[PDB]
Amino acid sequence: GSHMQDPEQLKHCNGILSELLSSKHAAYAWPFYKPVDASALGLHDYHDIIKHPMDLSTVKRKMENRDYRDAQEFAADVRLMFSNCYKYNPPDHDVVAMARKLQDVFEFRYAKMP
Ligand SMILES: Nc1nc2c(ncn2COCCO)c(=O)[nH]1
């Protein structure tokens, strides 16, 4: 059920999303900018292991099209994106180190929900 705080909380979500895509975090955010191109990377098992792909360009499109109805729905997709990375890759892989740093950015600012 829609709350009157939902538009404002979604604005905070959109702010976080803008930050995740900004130059400030680009050194570790870039693997998450676009959908994993499994074939191009030779990751021919990716879509057998990851049943629900997610990436920041897909989150952005969903925010722009008002697909997300509340902050929780946005947050679940962002976390899905990170969880896919932790599921597919070995935990010492550099892409996982980048995921953890970007998720720290996400979680600490998401916790600042006004
Ligand atoms: N190994 C691997 N590469 C990824 C993953 N997520 C993002 N990338 C890198 O894609 C960006 C293009 O080089 C992932 O989970 N698997």
Swiss-Prot record:
Q: Which residues form the Bromo domain?
A: 8-113
Taken from the UniProt record, the cysteine pairs bridged by disulfide bonds within this chain are none
Tell me the compartments it is located in. Nucleus; Chromosome
Q: Which family does it belong to?
A: Belongs to the BET family.
Comment block on domains: The first bromo domain specifically recognizes histone H4 acetylated at 'Lys-12' (H4K12ac). It also specifically binds histone H4 acetyl-methylated at 'Lys-5' and 'Lys-12' (H4K5acme and H4K12acme, respectively). The second bromo domain recognizes and binds histone H4 acetylated at 'Lys-5' and 'Lys-12' (H4K5ac and H4K12ac, respectively).
Relate the assembly described in the record. Homodimer. Interacts with E2F1. Interacts with (acetylated) STAT3; promoting STAT3 recruitment to chromatin. Interacts with CTCF; promoting BRD2 recruitment to chromatin.
What is the additional note?
Some specific inhibitors of BRD2 that prevent binding to acetylated histone are promising therapeutic molecules for the treatment of cancers or inflammatory diseases. ABBV-744, a small molecule, has been tested on tumors with success: ABBV-744 antiproliferative activity is mainly restricted to cell lines of acute myeloid leukaemia and prostate cancer and is able to displace BRD4 from chromatin. GSK046 (iBET-BD2), which specifically inhibits the second bromo domain, is a promising therapeutic small molecule for the treatment of inflammatory and autoimmune diseases.
Give a short account of what the protein does. Chromatin reader protein that specifically recognizes and binds histone H4 acetylated at 'Lys-5' and 'Lys-12' (H4K5ac and H4K12ac, respectively), thereby controlling gene expression and remodeling chromatin structures. Recruits transcription factors and coactivators to target gene sites, and activates RNA polymerase II machinery for transcriptional elongation.
Name of the protein in question: Bromodomain-containing protein 2
Gene this chain is encoded by: BRD2
Q: Indicate the span of the full protein covered.
A: 348 to 454 of 801
